[PDB]
Amino acid sequence: AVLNQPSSVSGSLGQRVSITCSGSSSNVGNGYVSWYQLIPGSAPRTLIYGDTSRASGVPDRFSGSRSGNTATLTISSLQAEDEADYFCASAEDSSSNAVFGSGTTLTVLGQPSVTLFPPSTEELNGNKATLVCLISDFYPGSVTVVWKADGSTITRNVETTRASKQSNSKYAASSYLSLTSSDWKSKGSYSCEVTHEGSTVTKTVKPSECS
Amino acid sequence: QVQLRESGPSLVKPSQTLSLTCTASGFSLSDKAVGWVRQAPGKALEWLGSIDTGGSTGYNPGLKSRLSITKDNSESQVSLSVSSVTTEDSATYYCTTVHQYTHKRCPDGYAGSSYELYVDAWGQGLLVTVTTAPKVYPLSSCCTVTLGCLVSSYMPEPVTVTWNSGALKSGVHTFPAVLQSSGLYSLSSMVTVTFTCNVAHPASSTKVDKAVEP
């Protein structure tokens, strides 16, 4: 089946935190736990194998330990680099069968711009148009996308992506307004008002004054 | 060095067999064991199976019926077969090297068994999603510079985006797609400063080149 983990944990920057992984006397009880770090966009990297041994290129800040039926990965001196999903694992009943943990979501607490695009001229030839508003490098990842047309707010055809972890421990997203070339020239101005911790960064394009 | 190249179809249809191939460059298949691990979109890593050097096979008991794994030393490749797939088997599949060892455990004076397995090296993961070709549109700003390259309406995931045949590696931010109500994805790949962005889609096997100017 699967191993127990808190699924969600939080700690502060530079401090110490611990992720528990607990199971039975047939899996964790035998005691050959492994630990893995999965950052979005990257491949899972192996961290600790056999309870306490660190793997290739793994600094000793990531320390594996075990107490009976509950293994524990402990991260010393937290960094933004460390936000990821950590999975434990041990073998059960055979050397050829593994079980994994639910995996917890590491959050580093103490850490403290959008370009707007008009539709391509080629796209309007099929009488279709797509407003692309690409937001990047904001933290944390909670943004409120509101499209504005001549002071009024747009509700139809709003398509926004959830926040996604970038390489720089920063969250980026995309939001798409799928319109037609007819009502794209109807309004006089279009605005992409994204809000991030109370601040509103606004990018604006006007159909006539852009060609 | 040592890498594991996963190769196979990024789309399959229900009640048919998904097959994948892992190409091993940097080590021998009669030296290391190979294991398969998949992650479902929103789930944990799921064990699938492993084949050691001596050709012996071992799978996740729940999926032993539907699974089968073989390899060819000459091609330095390992294969995987998941039969009678359903809409939940769509997942990212990782090719890995595993170290297996059955440690024995007798009393403190001198049977017993304590089993060890862990992943050594991880593949990159190709996401089989269980066809639609994309449409490419260049993007430029209204009146540093910012240039765009909008990929429009494609299924299934994923698409790989480069700029000028991998020669432009600077200032590029490829974005996560959106799941439109139509079920067609749309992602963009911005670049910030003769700029052609190359878009590929493994399912439809399409490769287009669209230059972008302001």
Author numbering:
A (entry chain B): 2 to 113, 119 to 217
B (entry chain A): 27 to 136, 174 to 193, 198 to 210, 217 to 266, 274 to 294
Reproduce passages from the article:
Each of the knob structures starts with the conserved sequence motif [CP(D/E/A)G(Y/W)], in which the initial cysteine residue forms the first disulfide bond with another cysteine residue in the knob, and the motif forms a type I β turn. The compact globular folds of the knobs are maintained primarily by several disulfide bonds, a feature that is similar to the core of other small disulfide rich proteins or domains such as voltage-gated sodium channel antagonist mu-conopeptide, CnIIIC.
The four antibodies with 6 cysteines (BOV-1, BOV-2, BOV-3, BOV-4) used three different cysteine pairing patterns; BOV-1 and BOV-2 used, while BOV-3 used and BOV-4 used pairing patterns. The knob of antibody BOV-1 has 2 additional anti-parallel β-strands, extending from the second and the third of the three antiparallel segments. These four knobs could be described as two-layered structures with the three antiparallel segments as the first layer, and the additional structural elements packed against the first layer as the second layer. However, electron density associated with 4 or 3 knob regions of antibodies BOV-1 or BOV-6 is mostly or totally absent, suggesting that these ultralong CDRH3s are highly flexible. To examine the extent of this flexibility, we superimposed the heavy chain variable domains of each Fab molecule in the asymmetric unit for antibodies BOV-1 or BOV-4 in one asymmetric unit. The twisting angles between the two strands of stalks are also different among copies of the Fabs within one asymmetric unit, suggesting that the CDRH3 stalks could undergo tilting and twisting motions due to their inherent flexibility. The superimposition of knobs on these Fabs within an individual asymmetric unit indicates that there are only small structural variations in knobs, suggesting that the knobs are structurally stable.
